Design a protein around this ligand. Structure first.
Ligand code: A1JKN
Ligand code: A1JKN
Ligand code: A1JKN
Ligand code: A1JKN
Ligand code: A1JKN
Lengths: 273, 278, 273, 277, 273
């Protein structure tokens, strides 16, 4: 099977690296196009063995599954450029935040009537095969197209089908989520440094603490509040630290973040639906 | 490189015109007598210093246009449309019109000027006052009829007084909020840092000097590093030490968020200052 | 003249790089010792041509001016280790935050009666020859020792003599200052990114804005408030941004920072004075 | 250079009293050359104008016929009723000086022009400290103001404080700054005195000291070429009492509160436009 | 009558300029001594007619009334230098914040038994003859010494005698007060500029408003709240602005400042009482 990437940014590189590391795709069965070849992301894809071309048309010809890993305001230009080159065999997978299936189908249908479109929202940890991906199938997607998508994206993390009207909220949670985690880990490490740890050890310990806690929850049937209860001895250090988190409205800030990212994602709609 | 020895004009003789004229003459790319500036108010302290520099001053904007090859519009954004009606008939094929006003779009300038002569050569720029010490930060966008080398000429000129690069025009309002207003954020921070030094027992003059030197060296380190500012921050803070204690109290006040708020507020206000039909 | 460094951390590397780049010292006339040779700072000093040794005693023998660029709680151990090896020719320059001249002289005087001690507070931008350094001369420092120190440290930035009781406050201002600036620049760049700039351009513009503003003030006789007034047109973008800084108590946060760093520096005193 | 000049106030409230008191104390106007009208002859301001020697009448018409310079010292929403009432009585000799916040020259000229075509209108924003001849006044001249009209206005208002001409579009902002400014200062002085009392001072002494401090600082700045931040720097010894107190002001966002105040007063003034311009 | 200043900083200049502008002292009857008069005051005092000497003892020998205008921690050093040079004719006027009469008398009495001491708290607006001064008379001050002090300091502003235990509070109110006013004027001008005024005009209007309001209160019998009530029309601009001041706790910030300055002044007591 042939996979192509339009756009060679962080997400394109991350998926290719994840895909090849899973053994589900040979790097040569992958082609990627970028309008900017000076990107650092484009340098590393060459070392992988991924074919690179400056013309999106060449990507479309080599590819069967076609990932649109470009910015939301760029999608309509890409669709206008290659819409004439879409064939029956193509599955077009848009990774752009906010951009609706119906808006993509509308553009592509001016060229050929039944484009097979899938919309997805993934995140950068696909690069270490621990991404979180959702997808929704378009009007003309065959039932096997969604199955194919799920099998491919399951190789690099969690993947599940959702109704399209959930994807803006997913973007605010697992799409933007890694950034919330990177911010938290920087701050936790500053906290470790303030109390006397070397920075390198503090980063390692904080990241290991977050990874292990996340894995515990994924492998548990218990509520996060129950796992929280299990950490804190009465009168102990942990419950004292939880109090100061609570006094600052820590929970409210993370709710605010998911909401703000979701609301901004809805504003990012560019084309007519 | 490009041989200049051209005439530059400033419509407006305020802080920006003085800062650019001072920077340009200090760089040696322009002689002061090849510069002409016009102001509706000849009593400005910036006007007196331009006179002593040897810059030619005139109350008549038309005379600046007739003198100039490169014409900087260094007036307030709402003043731009009056200037354009006033001198539009005087724009010749030789002119490059460089608007420095915050918010004012190229298309709004081209529309007004096209009513007189069809293909005005227009450049939009956003620079800042540190051009006066040749460490400005300048971006520019070229208009519809800007000729092949107009952008190259603009970049060569503005690079003599600091950083300069071409951008898409739709980035300029955000640049305005960051490096246009930026020096004011820094001056506020330096006043406050000196107040802190004085609180802890330093003489005011020493505290101002140390704080400014700290900001300058840190900024230079980052411009000369390939590392993330967070990594440079990490390299500086020993475990349990004075710096990480100070960083905590900055974080508790939402220091980072205040600077984000400032860039956003300046960018948003700049959009509002759109004074013409773009 | 011979210079040596006890400790091969960030500050040792920064001074050596600054010194050699100024042409005031050949890299071979410099020797540095580290208890941890696996430090990244130690790797680069080798490429410079600076002599490295694992034994502080060897540094003392090669050196005339001796920089103590180790952590405050480490100074007393270093002094106990090499105090017997101090000679009449040595000028001992302590860079450690908080550690008093009298405490260093007391330790060294148990070995030989008139140690020539200088205390200094510098910062990492000496690495690009724009440091801010102050120093105070000890009881037995000759008048030419301070002059020598000032000439050496002026090659890598601003340098001036202060009374020792100002150095804790200097530490809170120009010692910790660069970190305040790195934090501000990260945030300013986040602000530029929020409003649509690429991150690389936003970092460059923010850093250039801060450098130029700093240089303007250093080259001006005017008050920072006057230079601030000159930036803001009435009703304009800048004055709107200054208002939101003021509403958050921006000035108070920077005062808080200088104070907190100064107060913590006084707590870092380790030895008996 | 006008001792023949008659001045009228439509409105006999705080502002009319303050200006009449200041003018008469300045010696530029004899109190008998001043007439004031009010729909309420019971105000304490009316009873004080009477003992000052000002002529008082309930008829705005009579004030108009008495006056050469006519101050409109009524609330903004009252201006249109005044203008309809006395518009037909405006003569060529009249200079109509509106003091109401927010009310535009063009709105006033539009009303008066329905009667006689070229009314001479000046808009000003002053403040109550004219009553001790330390007011802060700006003015803008209307379409048909003669060039001597602005010079005359500035000569008259300079006798009771600072006075300068501005473009009209600055007057709403001036209103938020020097118009409302005295009230900010009275609030600050009450609070400073509470602080002095908290720390052990008698109330009367604390008020005197705080008011003298503010007066002297303001005069220092007015007589200095230096930035207010520079004078601040000159006051604060390192480690001293003043810089400690400045820190606690900064921690509460003191500067931002005063910016908020000028902004809020200016914005409200723009909402008080009553007439169509 | 001869007047001397030990110290040539901001306060000594301001009193000397005010005294000479008052015409109550011939400038040639004024001498001032400083070890480091590098402020422009050296050429300003000379043009003013003030005699300048580097030796504090020369000032003592010239002067009848001797103003100590040095920092509180410098006072005990001055008293030890000039103590043997105090004569019966001298009135010693300390302007230092926090330093008590009893601590000055104890110091000087080691030299001669009945030093005539006055403690003063004034402020910089004496330079425009609108200062605010309080003074307390010491144990051996003659009854005419206080009268002399009040006649002198009344020429440059308000002056009244207080009990000494009120002077710390006066320091927090009228001593520090001018700085509160300068901060307020800078911010008010920033407000004016935000709403469209040129900076120079905004500064002038704000300062004039402050000056006029203060003069109204000084010349009124009415409470400041009553003067506030007289300025605010119902529903008007001023009452809207007062609301936003109240919402930020504006009154409490000024109480906090007087308190903080007073408390810090009590900490500045340098000598033993
Ligand atoms: O004191 S506890 O909160 O029980 N504890 C649990 C993990 C580390 C500290
Ligand atoms: O609108 S301004 O505040 O005058 N301006 C100055 C620099 C960038 C924006
Ligand atoms: O104690 S530290 O925070 O490592 N230090 C480094 C520079 C000034 C203070
Ligand atoms: O201690 S100071 O802050 O320098 N001082 C100045 C006048 C009142 C108190
Ligand atoms: O509308 S008011 O609040 O009464 N007014 C008084 C002078 C400035 C504005």
């Amino acid at each position: 099977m042939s996979v192509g990437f339009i756009g060679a940014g962080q997400l394109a590189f991350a998926l290719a690296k994840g895909f090849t590391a899973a053994g589900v795709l040979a790097a040569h069965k992958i082609m990627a196009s970028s309008p900017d070849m000076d990107l650092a992301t484009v340098s590393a894809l060459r070392k992988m063995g991924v074919k690179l071309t400056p013309h999106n048309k060449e990507t479309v010809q080599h590819s069967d599954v076609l990932f649109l890993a470009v910015k939301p305001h760029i999608i309509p230009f890409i669709l206008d450029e290659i819409g004439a080159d879409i064939e029956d065999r193509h599955i077009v997978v848009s990774c752009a935040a906010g951009v609706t299936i119906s808006s993509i189908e509308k553009k592509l249908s001016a060229f050929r009537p039944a484009p097979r479109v899938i919309r997805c929202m993934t995140n950068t940890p696909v690069v270490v095969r621990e991404g979180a991906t959702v997808y929704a199938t378009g009007t003309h997607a065959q039932v096997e197209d969604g199955r194919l998508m799920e099998q491919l994206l399951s190789s690099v993390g969690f993947c599940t089908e959702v109704e399209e009207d959930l994807i803006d909220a997913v973007t605010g949670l697992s799409g933007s989520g890694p950034a919330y985690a990177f911010t938290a880990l920087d701050a936790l490490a500053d906290g470790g440094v303030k109390m006397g740890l070397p920075r390198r050890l503090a980063v390692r310990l904080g990241a290991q603490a977050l990874l292990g806690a996340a894995k515990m929850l994924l492998h548990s049937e218990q509520h996060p509040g129950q796992l929280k209860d299990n950490v804190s001895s009465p009168g102990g250090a942990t419950i004292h630290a939880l109090h100061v988190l609570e006094s600052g409205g820590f929970r409210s800030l993370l709710i605010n973040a998911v909401e703000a990212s979701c609301i901004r994602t809805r504003e990012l709609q560019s084309m007519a639906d």
